[PDB]
């Protein structure tokens, strides 16, 4: 639904804004 | 498929709702 497109940190963000304390693992650095 | 569906396509929080520990 939300048209939010993001990559690199932009991923770490949606992940950071999506859960937060739940924890989020971002495989592959850059 | 998190940077190929987000940088190229959109990630519905539902799809990013599966990347939490």
Curated annotation (Swiss-Prot), chain A:
Spans through the membrane: none
Organism for this UniProt entry: Homo sapiens
Impact reported for residue 24 to S: In HPRI; Los-Angeles
Protein name per its UniProtKB record: Insulin B chain
